[PDB]
Amino acid sequence: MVEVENVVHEDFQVTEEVKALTAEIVKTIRDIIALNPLYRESVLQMMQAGQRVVDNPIYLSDMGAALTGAESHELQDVLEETNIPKRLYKALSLLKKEFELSKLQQRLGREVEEKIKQTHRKYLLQEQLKIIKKELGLEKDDK
């Protein structure tokens, strides 16, 4: 089957401030893997933006966008985009979209568990109250 490598990848000549959005992408990926650990975090330390070893930035952006849990269709949609900031915008959007759900689940878990703790802790207080009024005063509230 006929195929051709029509891999368009235009980028501005001045490449100093253009990697700052990448810096925000890796900061969101660091926050996604720190608050929602999926894979080990050693791989993020292996491939850093400060090493100047990113010979293929398009590949680095795709690998960073791969941690997102967005449906495959979204990946196809990111490939449909031709401009570079549009795909960066979409990759960040995918990350934040997952991030809100993650934050909701985490807050809910700590909150629900603390509710269980406030349950049993108040029961511990009630148990102490009983015990301390068990062998201290013997109420004669019967027939």
């Binding site: 089957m1 495959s72 490939l79």
Partner: protein, 98 residues
């Protein structure tokens, strides 16, 4: 000039090593047809919404026009008889997959 591959619920993100273990044995026939080539390779394409394997063999429109060719490393086949390795190495946008 090979038949389309049966992704079968296996996303292969670009530049992210992945493994594919289809349950069907018809792709193994394709695995045996590419051992004679000197430079073997395999392509990875994506399926559209509401996945269905019978339309992939009937029609060729389910799969997206985009494709990601890459080279195979090595087979293992620990549990299944089809344990191929996939990678996102060479991206492509076919004009017409048909």
């Amino acid at each position: 000039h090979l038949p389309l591959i049966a992704i079968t619920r296996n996303p292969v993100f670009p530049r992210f090593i992945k493994i594919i273990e289809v349950k069907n044995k018809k792709l193994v026939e394709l695995l045996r047809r590419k051992v004679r080539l000197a430079q073997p390779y395999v392509g990875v394409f994506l399926k559209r919404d509401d996945s269905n394997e019978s339309d992939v063999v009937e029609s060729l429109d389910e799969i997206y026009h985009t494709g990601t060719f890459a080279q195979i490393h090595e087979m293992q086949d620990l549990g299944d008889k089809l344990r191929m390795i996939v990678m996102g190495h060479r991206r492509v946008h076919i004009s017409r997959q048909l």
